[PDB]
Protein backbone atom coordinates (compact mmCIF):
# COMPACT_ATOMS: atom_id res chain seq x y z
CA UNK A 1 0.00 0.00 0.00
CA UNK A 2 2.72 2.49 0.98
CA UNK A 3 5.16 2.62 -2.05
CA UNK A 4 2.13 1.91 -4.26
CA UNK A 5 1.20 5.49 -3.26
CA UNK A 6 3.57 6.34 -6.17
CA UNK A 7 0.19 7.19 -7.75
CA UNK A 8 0.56 10.54 -5.93
CA UNK A 9 3.99 10.84 -7.60
CA UNK A 10 2.15 10.24 -10.91
CA UNK A 11 -0.66 12.61 -9.78
CA UNK A 12 1.98 15.26 -9.03
CA UNK A 13 3.33 14.89 -12.58
CA UNK A 14 -0.16 15.80 -13.81
CA UNK A 15 -0.54 18.90 -11.64
CA UNK A 16 3.10 19.71 -12.33
CA UNK A 17 2.59 19.27 -16.16
CA UNK A 18 -0.37 21.66 -15.59
CA UNK A 19 2.38 24.27 -15.94
CA UNK A 20 2.16 23.72 -19.71
CA UNK A 21 -1.59 24.23 -19.68
CA UNK A 22 -0.87 27.41 -17.70
CA UNK A 23 2.07 28.95 -19.62
CA UNK A 24 -0.29 30.34 -22.28
CA UNK A 25 -0.65 33.97 -21.09
CA UNK A 26 2.58 34.89 -22.81
CA UNK A 27 5.42 32.49 -23.53
CA UNK A 28 6.30 31.55 -19.97
CA UNK A 29 8.71 29.28 -18.10
CA UNK A 30 11.01 28.10 -20.87
CA UNK A 31 13.33 27.23 -18.00
CA UNK A 32 12.83 23.78 -16.50
CA UNK A 33 15.67 23.55 -13.93
CA UNK A 34 17.54 21.09 -16.14
CA UNK A 35 20.48 18.83 -15.24
CA UNK A 36 23.31 19.19 -17.78
CA UNK A 37 26.16 21.65 -17.21
CA UNK A 38 29.45 20.54 -18.78
CA UNK A 39 31.35 22.70 -16.33
CA UNK A 40 33.86 21.27 -13.88
CA UNK A 41 36.17 19.89 -16.58
CA UNK A 42 34.62 20.66 -20.01
CA UNK A 43 37.62 19.24 -21.84
CA UNK A 44 37.76 20.72 -25.33
CA UNK A 45 40.76 18.82 -26.71
CA UNK A 46 43.19 18.93 -23.75
CA UNK A 47 42.44 17.77 -20.27
CA UNK A 48 43.34 19.36 -16.93
CA UNK A 49 45.64 17.25 -14.78
CA UNK A 50 44.42 19.07 -11.68
CA UNK A 51 45.49 17.21 -8.57
CA UNK A 52 43.46 15.16 -6.13
CA UNK A 53 44.06 17.90 -3.53
CA UNK A 54 43.64 21.05 -5.65
CA UNK A 55 40.15 22.17 -4.66
CA UNK A 56 38.29 23.54 -7.67
CA UNK A 57 34.85 24.97 -7.03
CA UNK A 58 32.10 23.13 -8.99
CA UNK A 59 31.17 26.49 -10.47
CA UNK A 60 34.72 26.94 -11.80
CA UNK A 61 34.55 25.75 -15.41
CA UNK A 62 38.23 24.90 -15.82
CA UNK A 63 38.18 24.40 -19.58
CA UNK A 64 40.81 22.66 -21.67
CA UNK A 65 44.52 22.66 -20.85
CA UNK A 66 45.04 23.54 -17.18
CA UNK A 67 47.32 22.26 -14.42
CA UNK A 68 47.01 23.08 -10.71
CA UNK A 69 49.51 22.24 -7.99
CA UNK A 70 49.03 20.43 -4.69
CA UNK A 71 47.31 22.78 -2.25
CA UNK A 72 46.23 25.47 -4.72
CA UNK A 73 42.56 26.38 -4.99
CA UNK A 74 40.32 27.44 -7.85
CA UNK A 75 37.54 29.31 -6.10
CA UNK A 76 33.86 29.92 -6.79
CA UNK A 77 32.75 30.86 -10.29
CA UNK A 78 36.16 31.31 -11.92
CA UNK A 79 36.29 30.18 -15.54
CA UNK A 80 39.70 28.92 -16.68
CA UNK A 81 39.41 28.50 -20.48
CA UNK A 82 42.75 26.90 -21.33
CA UNK A 83 41.27 26.23 -24.74
CA UNK A 84 43.50 28.10 -27.22
CA UNK A 85 46.68 28.47 -25.14
CA UNK A 86 48.16 26.47 -22.28
CA UNK A 87 47.53 27.39 -18.64
CA UNK A 88 49.15 26.25 -15.41
CA UNK A 89 48.91 26.90 -11.67
CA UNK A 90 51.58 26.27 -9.07
CA UNK A 91 51.09 24.61 -5.70
CA UNK A 92 49.34 27.15 -3.46
CA UNK A 93 48.07 29.66 -6.04
CA UNK A 94 44.58 30.48 -4.76
CA UNK A 95 42.85 31.83 -7.84
CA UNK A 96 40.00 33.50 -5.99
CA UNK A 97 36.37 34.06 -6.92
CA UNK A 98 35.07 35.27 -10.28
CA UNK A 99 38.45 34.89 -11.99
CA UNK A 100 38.89 34.92 -15.78
CA UNK A 101 42.18 32.98 -16.14
CA UNK A 102 41.31 32.38 -19.77
CA UNK A 103 44.37 33.03 -21.97
CA UNK A 104 44.53 34.27 -25.56
CA UNK A 105 44.53 33.59 -29.24
CA UNK A 106 46.45 36.81 -30.01
CA UNK A 107 46.23 40.56 -29.50
CA UNK A 108 47.60 42.65 -32.39
CA UNK A 109 51.00 40.92 -32.41
CA UNK A 110 51.48 37.20 -31.82
CA UNK A 111 51.93 36.97 -28.04
CA UNK A 112 50.82 33.42 -27.35
CA UNK A 113 52.74 33.25 -24.00
CA UNK A 114 50.97 30.46 -22.04
CA UNK A 115 49.85 31.81 -18.67
CA UNK A 116 51.92 30.15 -15.95
CA UNK A 117 51.22 31.05 -12.32
CA UNK A 118 53.71 29.94 -9.69
CA UNK A 119 53.33 28.81 -6.10
CA UNK A 120 51.66 30.70 -3.25
CA UNK A 121 50.27 33.26 -5.73
CA UNK A 122 47.31 34.70 -3.86
CA UNK A 123 45.20 35.98 -6.75
CA UNK A 124 42.33 38.25 -5.81
CA UNK A 125 38.60 38.05 -6.29
CA UNK A 126 37.19 38.94 -9.71
CA UNK A 127 40.73 39.00 -11.12
CA UNK A 128 41.08 38.92 -14.90
CA UNK A 129 44.42 37.32 -15.91
CA UNK A 130 43.81 37.47 -19.71
CA UNK A 131 47.35 36.74 -21.00
CA UNK A 132 50.16 37.39 -18.52
CA UNK A 133 52.72 35.18 -16.82
CA UNK A 134 52.76 35.49 -13.02
CA UNK A 135 55.72 34.66 -10.79
CA UNK A 136 55.91 32.81 -7.49
CA UNK A 137 54.87 34.28 -4.14
CA UNK A 138 53.14 37.42 -5.44
CA UNK A 139 49.72 38.75 -4.45
CA UNK A 140 47.50 39.99 -7.27
CA UNK A 141 44.72 42.32 -6.20
CA UNK A 142 41.00 41.66 -5.90
CA UNK A 143 39.58 43.12 -9.10
CA UNK A 144 42.87 43.23 -11.01
CA UNK A 145 42.88 42.83 -14.79
CA UNK A 146 46.22 41.40 -15.93
CA UNK A 147 46.50 41.84 -19.69
CA UNK A 148 48.70 40.20 -22.32
CA UNK A 149 52.32 39.43 -21.49
CA UNK A 150 52.62 41.12 -18.09
CA UNK A 151 55.24 39.17 -16.16
CA UNK A 152 54.21 40.02 -12.60
CA UNK A 153 57.50 39.58 -10.75
CA UNK A 154 57.79 37.83 -7.40
CA UNK A 155 56.44 39.38 -4.18
CA UNK A 156 55.11 42.38 -6.11
CA UNK A 157 51.49 42.95 -5.16
CA UNK A 158 49.10 44.44 -7.69
CA UNK A 159 46.58 46.77 -6.09
CA UNK A 160 42.86 46.23 -5.70
CA UNK A 161 41.07 46.90 -8.97
CA UNK A 162 44.48 47.62 -10.50
CA UNK A 163 44.25 47.22 -14.26
CA UNK A 164 47.67 46.53 -15.79
CA UNK A 165 48.30 47.41 -19.43
CA UNK A 166 50.03 45.14 -21.93
CA UNK A 167 53.73 44.26 -21.56
CA UNK A 168 54.07 46.39 -18.39
CA UNK A 169 55.68 43.63 -16.36
CA UNK A 170 55.90 45.05 -12.84
CA UNK A 171 59.17 44.73 -10.87
CA UNK A 172 59.55 42.68 -7.71
CA UNK A 173 57.98 44.32 -4.67
CA UNK A 174 56.80 47.31 -6.73
CA UNK A 175 53.13 47.62 -5.80
CA UNK A 176 51.35 48.59 -9.01
CA UNK A 177 47.92 50.13 -9.47
CA UNK A 178 45.81 52.66 -11.28
CA UNK A 179 43.72 52.38 -14.43
CA UNK A 180 46.84 53.25 -16.46
CA UNK A 181 49.88 51.05 -15.96
CA UNK A 182 51.66 53.08 -13.27
CA UNK A 183 53.52 51.92 -10.18
CA UNK A 184 52.47 53.02 -6.70
CA UNK A 185 55.17 52.23 -4.12
CA UNK A 186 57.45 49.67 -2.46
CA UNK A 187 55.40 49.04 0.67
CA UNK A 188 57.37 47.01 3.23
CA UNK A 189 58.62 43.56 4.21
CA UNK A 190 55.54 42.92 6.37
CA UNK A 191 53.73 43.11 3.03
CA UNK A 192 55.52 39.99 1.76
CA UNK A 193 55.13 38.36 5.17
CA UNK A 194 51.36 38.83 4.94
CA UNK A 195 51.45 37.69 1.30
CA UNK A 196 52.91 34.34 2.31
CA UNK A 197 50.62 34.13 5.35
CA UNK A 198 47.50 34.75 3.27
CA UNK A 199 48.73 32.27 0.65
CA UNK A 200 49.15 29.39 3.09
CA UNK A 201 45.98 30.33 4.98
CA UNK A 202 43.98 30.35 1.75
CA UNK A 203 45.50 26.98 0.89
CA UNK A 204 44.35 25.38 4.13
CA UNK A 205 41.07 27.32 3.87
CA UNK A 206 40.38 25.67 0.53
CA UNK A 207 41.31 22.47 2.33
CA UNK A 208 38.50 23.43 4.72
CA UNK A 209 36.06 23.66 1.80
CA UNK A 210 35.78 19.89 1.63
CA UNK A 211 32.07 20.25 2.43
CA UNK A 212 31.69 21.52 -1.14
CA UNK A 213 32.34 17.94 -2.31
CA UNK A 214 30.21 16.20 0.31
CA UNK A 215 27.77 13.45 -0.60
CA UNK A 216 23.95 13.60 -0.34
CA UNK A 217 24.09 11.44 2.77
CA UNK A 218 26.78 13.74 4.17
CA UNK A 219 24.82 16.90 3.31
CA UNK A 220 21.68 15.65 5.03
CA UNK A 221 23.84 14.46 7.93
CA UNK A 222 25.29 17.96 8.21
CA UNK A 223 21.66 19.09 8.34
CA UNK A 224 22.02 17.86 11.92
CA UNK A 225 23.40 21.39 12.43
CA UNK A 226 19.96 22.20 13.87
CA UNK A 227 20.59 19.92 16.85
CA UNK A 228 23.94 21.62 17.49
CA UNK B 1 0.84 37.72 -15.28
CA UNK B 2 -2.35 36.49 -13.62
CA UNK B 3 -2.58 33.09 -15.27
CA UNK B 4 1.18 32.74 -14.88
CA UNK B 5 0.62 33.16 -11.14
CA UNK B 6 -2.12 30.52 -11.26
CA UNK B 7 0.30 28.23 -13.07
CA UNK B 8 2.86 28.80 -10.33
CA UNK B 9 0.18 27.74 -7.89
CA UNK B 10 -0.83 24.51 -9.65
CA UNK B 11 2.85 23.54 -10.10
CA UNK B 12 3.66 24.11 -6.45
CA UNK B 13 0.76 21.95 -5.36
CA UNK B 14 1.98 19.33 -7.87
CA UNK B 15 5.61 19.50 -6.82
CA UNK B 16 4.47 19.30 -3.20
CA UNK B 17 2.23 16.39 -3.93
CA UNK B 18 5.26 14.46 -5.22
CA UNK B 19 7.65 15.83 -2.61
CA UNK B 20 5.64 14.53 0.31
CA UNK B 21 2.81 12.63 -1.18
CA UNK B 22 5.17 10.01 -2.57
CA UNK B 23 8.73 10.84 -1.40
CA UNK B 24 7.08 10.12 1.98
CA UNK B 25 7.95 6.44 1.28
CA UNK B 26 11.67 6.55 2.28
CA UNK B 27 12.76 9.10 -0.35
CA UNK B 28 14.90 12.16 0.58
CA UNK B 29 15.82 12.72 -3.11
CA UNK B 30 13.83 16.00 -3.16
CA UNK B 31 15.85 17.34 -0.18
CA UNK B 32 19.12 17.38 -2.17
CA UNK B 33 20.35 20.96 -2.54
CA UNK B 34 20.88 20.72 -6.28
CA UNK B 35 21.61 23.90 -8.17
CA UNK B 36 19.11 25.97 -10.11
CA UNK B 37 21.36 28.25 -12.17
CA UNK B 38 21.12 25.55 -14.86
CA UNK B 39 18.02 27.52 -15.85
CA UNK B 40 20.27 29.26 -18.35
CA UNK B 41 17.38 30.95 -20.15
CA UNK B 42 15.41 32.12 -17.12
CA UNK B 43 12.01 33.40 -18.14
CA UNK B 44 9.18 35.82 -17.35
CA UNK B 45 6.11 36.87 -19.28
CA UNK B 46 9.00 37.81 -21.57
CA UNK B 47 11.33 34.96 -22.53
CA UNK B 48 14.90 34.61 -23.83
CA UNK B 49 15.11 33.57 -27.49
CA UNK B 50 18.25 31.88 -28.82
CA UNK B 51 18.91 30.34 -32.22
CA UNK B 52 20.67 27.05 -32.99
CA UNK B 53 24.23 28.19 -33.78
CA UNK B 54 24.60 30.15 -30.55
CA UNK B 55 26.58 28.46 -27.79
CA UNK B 56 25.37 29.37 -24.30
CA UNK B 57 27.51 28.27 -21.54
CA UNK B 58 25.97 26.26 -18.70
CA UNK B 59 27.93 28.27 -16.14
CA UNK B 60 26.17 31.36 -17.55
CA UNK B 61 22.64 32.60 -16.94
CA UNK B 62 20.60 34.39 -19.61
CA UNK B 63 17.72 36.08 -17.77
CA UNK B 64 15.03 38.42 -19.03
CA UNK B 65 13.97 39.35 -22.54
CA UNK B 66 16.83 38.10 -24.71
CA UNK B 67 17.07 37.75 -28.49
CA UNK B 68 20.36 35.90 -29.07
CA UNK B 69 20.69 35.71 -32.84
CA UNK B 70 23.06 33.66 -35.01
CA UNK B 71 26.69 33.03 -34.10
CA UNK B 72 26.36 34.93 -30.82
CA UNK B 73 27.85 33.28 -27.75
CA UNK B 74 27.47 33.62 -23.98
CA UNK B 75 30.51 31.99 -22.42
CA UNK B 76 31.21 30.53 -19.03
CA UNK B 77 29.73 32.67 -16.27
CA UNK B 78 28.17 35.54 -18.23
CA UNK B 79 24.82 37.03 -17.23
CA UNK B 80 22.68 38.65 -19.92
CA UNK B 81 20.24 39.76 -17.21
CA UNK B 82 17.87 42.06 -19.08
CA UNK B 83 14.41 41.84 -17.49
CA UNK B 84 13.31 45.45 -18.04
CA UNK B 85 13.97 45.91 -21.76
CA UNK B 86 14.96 43.32 -24.34
CA UNK B 87 18.62 42.32 -24.64
CA UNK B 88 18.47 42.44 -28.43
CA UNK B 89 21.87 40.84 -28.97
CA UNK B 90 22.60 40.77 -32.69
CA UNK B 91 24.38 38.14 -34.72
CA UNK B 92 27.85 36.67 -34.39
CA UNK B 93 28.69 38.54 -31.19
CA UNK B 94 31.15 37.08 -28.71
CA UNK B 95 30.64 37.87 -24.99
CA UNK B 96 33.63 35.56 -24.28
CA UNK B 97 33.40 35.22 -20.42
CA UNK B 98 32.05 36.54 -17.06
CA UNK B 99 30.54 39.66 -18.67
CA UNK B 100 27.18 41.24 -17.90
CA UNK B 101 24.63 42.94 -20.15
CA UNK B 102 22.04 44.76 -18.05
CA UNK B 103 18.93 46.81 -18.43
CA UNK B 104 18.73 46.05 -14.72
CA UNK B 105 15.84 47.80 -13.03
CA UNK B 106 16.33 51.02 -11.08
CA UNK B 107 13.77 53.58 -9.97
CA UNK B 108 13.61 54.92 -13.55
CA UNK B 109 16.32 57.39 -12.52
CA UNK B 110 17.63 57.45 -16.09
CA UNK B 111 14.90 55.57 -17.98
CA UNK B 112 16.82 52.35 -18.60
CA UNK B 113 16.87 51.66 -22.34
CA UNK B 114 17.25 48.31 -24.15
CA UNK B 115 20.77 47.00 -24.80
CA UNK B 116 20.90 46.50 -28.58
CA UNK B 117 24.21 44.69 -28.92
CA UNK B 118 25.36 44.78 -32.52
CA UNK B 119 27.02 42.21 -34.77
CA UNK B 120 30.38 40.42 -34.46
CA UNK B 121 30.85 42.25 -31.14
CA UNK B 122 33.66 40.48 -29.28
CA UNK B 123 32.94 41.79 -25.79
CA UNK B 124 35.70 40.77 -23.37
CA UNK B 125 35.68 39.37 -19.81
CA UNK B 126 34.07 41.05 -16.84
CA UNK B 127 32.66 43.76 -19.05
CA UNK B 128 29.69 45.08 -17.13
CA UNK B 129 27.76 46.55 -20.06
CA UNK B 130 24.70 48.22 -18.57
CA UNK B 131 22.05 49.77 -20.80
CA UNK B 132 24.35 49.70 -23.82
CA UNK B 133 23.34 50.28 -27.44
CA UNK B 134 26.71 48.97 -28.57
CA UNK B 135 26.84 48.72 -32.36
CA UNK B 136 28.42 46.09 -34.59
CA UNK B 137 32.02 44.83 -34.96
CA UNK B 138 33.05 46.49 -31.71
CA UNK B 139 35.58 45.34 -29.13
CA UNK B 140 35.16 45.78 -25.40
CA UNK B 141 38.11 44.95 -23.20
CA UNK B 142 38.82 42.61 -20.32
CA UNK B 143 37.57 43.65 -16.90
CA UNK B 144 35.82 46.58 -18.58
CA UNK B 145 32.70 48.43 -17.47
CA UNK B 146 30.12 50.59 -19.24
CA UNK B 147 27.25 52.85 -18.22
CA UNK B 148 23.73 53.78 -19.26
CA UNK B 149 22.77 54.85 -22.76
CA UNK B 150 26.25 54.35 -24.20
CA UNK B 151 26.45 53.94 -27.98
CA UNK B 152 29.77 52.31 -28.89
CA UNK B 153 29.71 53.08 -32.61
CA UNK B 154 31.24 50.92 -35.34
CA UNK B 155 34.76 49.62 -34.63
CA UNK B 156 34.95 51.41 -31.28
CA UNK B 157 37.59 49.36 -29.48
CA UNK B 158 36.98 50.09 -25.81
CA UNK B 159 40.05 48.98 -23.90
CA UNK B 160 40.58 46.96 -20.73
CA UNK B 161 39.51 48.19 -17.30
CA UNK B 162 37.70 51.02 -19.06
CA UNK B 163 34.62 52.76 -17.66
CA UNK B 164 32.60 54.50 -20.36
CA UNK B 165 30.25 57.20 -19.08
CA UNK B 166 26.52 57.79 -19.51
CA UNK B 167 24.93 58.56 -22.89
CA UNK B 168 28.39 58.96 -24.46
CA UNK B 169 27.96 58.31 -28.19
CA UNK B 170 31.55 57.18 -28.76
CA UNK B 171 32.54 57.96 -32.37
CA UNK B 172 32.96 55.26 -35.01
CA UNK B 173 36.47 53.87 -34.65
CA UNK B 174 37.64 55.90 -31.64
CA UNK B 175 39.56 54.01 -28.96
CA UNK B 176 38.36 54.98 -25.47
CA UNK B 177 40.24 53.16 -22.73
CA UNK B 178 39.92 55.09 -19.44
CA UNK B 179 37.79 55.45 -16.25
CA UNK B 180 36.75 59.01 -17.33
CA UNK B 181 35.70 58.18 -20.92
CA UNK B 182 38.43 59.64 -23.20
CA UNK B 183 39.34 59.20 -26.89
CA UNK B 184 42.96 58.11 -27.26
CA UNK B 185 43.85 57.26 -30.87
CA UNK B 186 42.28 56.52 -34.22
CA UNK B 187 42.43 52.73 -34.37
CA UNK B 188 44.80 51.11 -36.83
CA UNK B 189 43.76 48.69 -39.56
CA UNK B 190 45.62 45.70 -38.12
CA UNK B 191 43.41 46.06 -35.04
CA UNK B 192 40.45 46.12 -37.43
CA UNK B 193 41.58 42.83 -38.95
CA UNK B 194 42.09 41.38 -35.47
CA UNK B 195 38.64 42.39 -34.24
CA UNK B 196 36.92 41.20 -37.41
CA UNK B 197 38.75 37.86 -37.32
CA UNK B 198 38.45 37.13 -33.59
CA UNK B 199 34.71 37.35 -34.25
CA UNK B 200 34.74 34.25 -36.46
CA UNK B 201 37.50 32.68 -34.28
CA UNK B 202 35.14 32.41 -31.26
CA UNK B 203 32.14 31.88 -33.60
CA UNK B 204 33.96 28.61 -34.40
CA UNK B 205 35.26 28.16 -30.85
CA UNK B 206 31.65 28.49 -29.61
CA UNK B 207 30.24 26.10 -32.19
CA UNK B 208 32.93 23.98 -30.56
CA UNK B 209 32.98 23.19 -26.81
CA UNK B 210 30.20 20.76 -27.67
CA UNK B 211 28.70 20.49 -24.20
CA UNK B 212 25.64 18.51 -25.29
CA UNK B 213 26.56 15.36 -23.33
CA UNK B 214 26.61 13.70 -19.91
CA UNK B 215 29.36 12.12 -17.80
CA UNK B 216 27.72 9.22 -15.95
CA UNK B 217 30.95 7.71 -14.56
CA UNK B 218 31.52 10.94 -12.65
CA UNK B 219 27.84 10.91 -11.68
CA UNK B 220 28.30 7.38 -10.35
CA UNK B 221 31.38 8.48 -8.39
CA UNK B 222 29.75 11.57 -6.88
CA UNK B 223 26.85 9.26 -6.03
CA UNK B 224 29.23 7.38 -3.74
Amino acid sequence: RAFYSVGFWIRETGQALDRLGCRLQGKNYFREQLSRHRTLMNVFDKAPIVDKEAFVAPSASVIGDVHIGRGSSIWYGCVLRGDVNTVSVGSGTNIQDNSLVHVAKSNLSGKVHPTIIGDNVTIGHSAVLHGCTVEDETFIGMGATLLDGVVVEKHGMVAAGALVRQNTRIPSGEVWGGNPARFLRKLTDEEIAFISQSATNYSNLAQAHAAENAKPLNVIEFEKVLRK
Amino acid sequence: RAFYSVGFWIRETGQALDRLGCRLQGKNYFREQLSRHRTLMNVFDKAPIVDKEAFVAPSASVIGDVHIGRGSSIWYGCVLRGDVNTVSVGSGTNIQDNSLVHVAKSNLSGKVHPTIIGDNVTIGHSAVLHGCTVEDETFIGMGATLLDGVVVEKHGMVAAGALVRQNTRIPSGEVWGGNPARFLRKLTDEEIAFISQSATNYSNLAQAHAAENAKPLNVIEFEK
Binding site: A2, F3 | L24, Q25, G26
Partner: peptide
Protein backbone atom coordinates in the same frame (compact mmCIF):
# COMPACT_ATOMS: atom_id res chain seq x y z
CA UNK C 1 9.51 -1.96 -2.14
CA UNK C 2 9.21 -1.51 1.62
CA UNK C 3 9.53 1.14 4.35
CA UNK C 4 10.18 1.47 8.08
CA UNK C 5 7.77 0.87 10.93
CA UNK C 6 6.54 3.76 13.11
CA UNK C 7 5.99 5.86 9.96
CA UNK C 8 3.67 3.68 7.89
CA UNK C 9 1.68 3.49 11.12
CA UNK C 10 1.60 7.29 11.04
CA UNK C 11 0.45 7.40 7.42
CA UNK C 12 -2.24 4.80 8.13
CA UNK C 13 -3.36 6.93 11.07
CA UNK C 14 -3.43 10.04 8.90
CA UNK C 15 -5.57 8.17 6.38
CA UNK C 16 -7.78 7.07 9.28
CA UNK C 17 -8.13 10.72 10.29
CA UNK C 18 -9.20 12.09 6.87
CA UNK C 19 -11.34 9.02 6.01
CA UNK C 20 -12.83 9.15 9.50
CA UNK C 21 -13.43 12.89 9.43
CA UNK C 22 -14.95 12.63 5.92
CA UNK C 23 -17.45 10.27 7.50
CA UNK C 24 -18.01 12.86 10.22
CA UNK C 25 -18.78 15.94 8.13
CA UNK C 26 -20.73 13.42 6.05
CA UNK C 27 -22.84 12.52 9.11
Amino acid sequence: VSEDKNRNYAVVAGVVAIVGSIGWYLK
